[PDB]
Design a protein around this ligand. Sequence first.
Ligand SMILES: Nc1nc2c(ncn2[C@@H]2O[C@H](COP(=O)(O)OP(=O)(O)OP(=O)(O)O)[C@@H](O)[C@H]2O)c(=O)[nH]1
Ligand SMILES: [Mg+2]
Length: 176
Amino acid sequence: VLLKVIILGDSGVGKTSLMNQYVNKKFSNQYKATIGADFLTKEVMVDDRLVTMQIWDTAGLERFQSLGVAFYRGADCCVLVFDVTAPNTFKTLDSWRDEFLIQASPRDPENFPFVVLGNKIDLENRQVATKRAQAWCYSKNNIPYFETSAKEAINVEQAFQTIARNALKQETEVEL
Ligand SMILES: Nc1nc2c(ncn2[C@@H]2O[C@H](COP(=O)(O)OP(=O)(O)OP(=O)(O)O)[C@@H](O)[C@H]2O)c(=O)[nH]1
Ligand SMILES: [Mg+2]
């Protein structure tokens, strides 16, 4: 059982940090822009069930975005990340959501698993209100929302638990 998860979001929101924190329990304040898309794997237990989580990290900068988009189509869950201290990254969520739908072409789009992460909550200069973020998530088809901190490892395991659970459900429905 291989679960494919795709992480999308603007440059600098912390996609790579979140993945490394979750997969390797490691964080680095040093920024290294992601080029293209690639994955890291992590075997995990989803409600007493072993699965191989294939987590795809992508380039937030359009300049480093690859033309290869085949990795999308079989996705079981799409993770949308934004920076709680940067409203601009929150306003682009619809574009990221739409890009995922277009590239993955899931059947029954409105029910495909999306999980939103408001990252960098550890910073004092927060600018995106929780209520505002929850409202957007609700306007979608009520997709789960988690406020996280890759740096302080806050809510990372919890968020990925839901990501893994929902990805499994989607995966199961597909094979059926
Ligand atoms: N305060 C804080 N800063 C964070 C956190 N996670 C990442 N950052 C910083 O946000 C910056 C971007 O982190 P990355 O993980 O490289 O961001 P990205 O989304 O992978 O950027 P691209 O690969 O270019 O799309 C870096 O300065 C990180 O140190 C976090 O939880 N809290
Ligand atoms: Mg990156």
